[PDB]
Amino acid sequence: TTTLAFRFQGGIIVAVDSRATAGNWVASQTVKKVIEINPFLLGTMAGGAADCQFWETWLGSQCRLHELREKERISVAAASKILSNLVYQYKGAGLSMGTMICGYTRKEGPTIYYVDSDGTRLKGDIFCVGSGQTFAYGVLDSNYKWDLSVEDALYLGKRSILAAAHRDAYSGGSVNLYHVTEDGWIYHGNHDVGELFWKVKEEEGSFNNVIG
């Protein structure tokens, strides 16, 4: 799997691939690897499909109980730490999850938290997680600036997944785009690599390794 989220002037961009595999078998190319916890909170999934899906769904229940009890939307820090404290209780059990908690709140602003199943919790501006995290990093890091436009940021996030989708055998299917602002997350569509690759190759003039 390949997932990346990065922070810029316009807010937070979240791009994920849509493929799930069992060994070398491609199980599905149509998986939602982003969970919409609430209007201002997003969850990214890497590692065990069941582990990520179950526990990130469970988190959404805990985030709802927080705003019922405290009459206030949970902070990205608190939301991320509920999940990181949960997986830490299961440390050594063999949970395999690599997740990014992305959201906006008034007190924090746009925030990204990397949370994995060995209990690591990191705040940061750029994260790539999955088998093709390195392929995504390669394109993202070499093109990233803070002053990217919402249009350019969305494209770079999309292009970084495509890059990994290509080279990494275990990444592909389609690219799911999200843009997190002060007003909440906005969905920017599902992009099939089948069409996107040839569209990018032709328009960009890149992917010269491939027989055109």
């Binding site: 799997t1 799930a20 595999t21 069992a22 999934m45 590692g47 065990g48 069941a50 999955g130």
Partner: peptide
């Protein structure tokens, strides 16, 4: 089981 699957992975992502």
């Amino acid at each position: 089981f699957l992975y992502x």
